[PDB]
Amino acid sequence: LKLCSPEEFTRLCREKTQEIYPIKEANGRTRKALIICNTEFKHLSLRYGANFDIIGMKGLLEDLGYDVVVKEELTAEGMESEMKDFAALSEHQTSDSTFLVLMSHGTLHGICGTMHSEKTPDVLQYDTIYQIFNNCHCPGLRDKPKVIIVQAARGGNSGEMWIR
């Protein structure tokens, strides 16, 4: 990870104060990030390589200054519970931002829990994520960037085609 110099950090935070998100100095800073990953499923295929993604995202977020919370093998209600728990951490108040990384099987409208199937739907709506972390339900992250990374397909169709 290439670093930004303290001089450029100070220059930008002074020159364009109203158009950048304010950054807290690292001394009392308590950045938290969340990784939710489902690898094994009751009805769906095993997600080989998911642990490679966890390790890669975990290390990048730590290099960026975040203490990373990792939760695995959760149903849709388990993901909701864990996100609400994470949204309520008091360390967000002494943070300036968060990353929320979600890795699982996906559908058009949500991320799959471990128990998902067509006959037994187990899905966390992407819309629910915003409700859990918005200014009404997550006071510690009010006015701070909430970055959602979604590692999941959004359907079953191929994304390329032949043209002439």
Binding site: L1, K2, L3, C4, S5, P6, E8, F9, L12, C13, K16, Q18, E19, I20, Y21, I23, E25, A26, Y48, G49, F52, D53, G56, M57, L60, D63, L64, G65, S97, M103, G106, L108, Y126, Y130, F133, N134, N135, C136, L141, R142, D143, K144, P145, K146, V147, I148, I149, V150, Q151, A152, A153, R154, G155, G156, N157, S158, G159, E160
Partner: protein, 87 residues
């Protein structure tokens, strides 16, 4: 007492466009995650979050036999998000 937006300061980056598949490396890593890490490690020092996401999307621009296009969604950032790595 003060007023506040209900929803603000969110950005979402999906590995694919709606209705489409996401793909993995021969080694098993997600192309999306791998390039996301690569662009962050190279550009977080001088670029804000959106420009980093844009560079990720540019890396998927050339179509292949297993194409995908990461997608920025529901974005309500009102400022640039610089990470200032090392500070």
């Amino acid at each position: 007492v003060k007023l506040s937006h209900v929803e603000k300061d969110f950005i979402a980056f999906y590995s694919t466009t709606p209705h489409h598949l996401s793909y993995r490396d021969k080694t098993g890593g997600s192309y999306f995650i791998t390039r996301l890490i690569s662009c962050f490690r190279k550009h977080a020092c001088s670029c804000h979050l959106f420009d980093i996401f844009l560079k990720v999307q540019q890396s998927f621009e050339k179509a292949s036999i297993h194409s995908q296009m990461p997608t920025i969604d529901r974005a309500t950032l009102t400022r640039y998000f610089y990470l200032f790595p090392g500070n």
